[PDB]
């Protein structure tokens, strides 16, 4: 009502973790970003140039543009009854490569390896069995489960 600025209420959001202050590192500088990659937008509070608005601090999107020091990202934002695609521009210090598709890529790679082996005629690995089946249980220790006087 009385005060609504660009960075209002970011006291705990734009702060560094305990005993982890400092500035970005050469690993961040040496990271390659292409158009079409998935990235996470995480604001780095020690840079302060090209920082995103607080709404975008935990979101994942697609890169649509690369400049000498900046990245353009598409991020979904629901407004009233629809979802908008917002284009934000940030410095490269404030993005990270996303691992949101690791499992899918791994599944495709394993499928290719299986196809190669099946065509080669190599023996396939033994398929895993279910853990919800029956069987005979041979016990080592049996006890008595009870509520005793000393318990209370």
């Amino acid at each position: 009502v009385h005060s609504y600025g660009y960075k209002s209420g970011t006291r705990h959001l734009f702060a560094k973790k305990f005993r982890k202050h400092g500035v970005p590192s050469v690993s961040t500088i040496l990271t390659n970003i292409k158009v079409g990659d998935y990235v996470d937008v995480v604001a780095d509070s020690a840079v302060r140039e090209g920082m995103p608005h607080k709404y975008y601090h935990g979101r994942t999107g697609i890169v649509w543009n690369v400049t000498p020091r900046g990245v353009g990202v598409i991020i979904n934002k629901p407004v009233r009854t629809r979802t908008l695609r917002k284009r934000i521009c940030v410095r490269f210090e404030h993005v990270r490569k996303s691992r949101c598709q690791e499992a899918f890529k791994a599944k495709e790679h394993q499928f290719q390896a299986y196809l190669a082996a099946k065509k080669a005629g190599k023996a396939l690995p033994p398929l895993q069995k279910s853990s919800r089946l029956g069987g005979i249980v041979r016990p080592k220790n049996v006890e008595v489960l009870a509520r005793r006087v000393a318990d209370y």
Binding site: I62, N65, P78, T81, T83, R85
Partner: protein, 66 residues
């Protein structure tokens, strides 16, 4: 006199649903992108259009032959 509340708003917003975003492959304009790459891509696309016209002419001639 000046009341404020959000009481019925989510219910209103879900009657015709929250619509999903437009797919990535539609409305994929490049306006506002980094200029030098844009300028190069335009030249490549012009050459590609010329090649498409030539390929169609060759197909038509081949079909006429047989």
């Amino acid at each position: 006199s000046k009341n404020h509340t959000n009481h019925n708003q989510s219910s209103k917003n879900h009657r015709n649903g929250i619509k999903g975003p437009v797919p990535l492959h539609l409305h994929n304009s490049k306006r506002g992108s980094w200029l030098p790459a844009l300028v190069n891509a335009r030249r490549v696309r012009k050459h590609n259009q010329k090649a498409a016209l030539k390929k169609r002419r060759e197909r038509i001639a081949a079909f006429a032959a047989k």
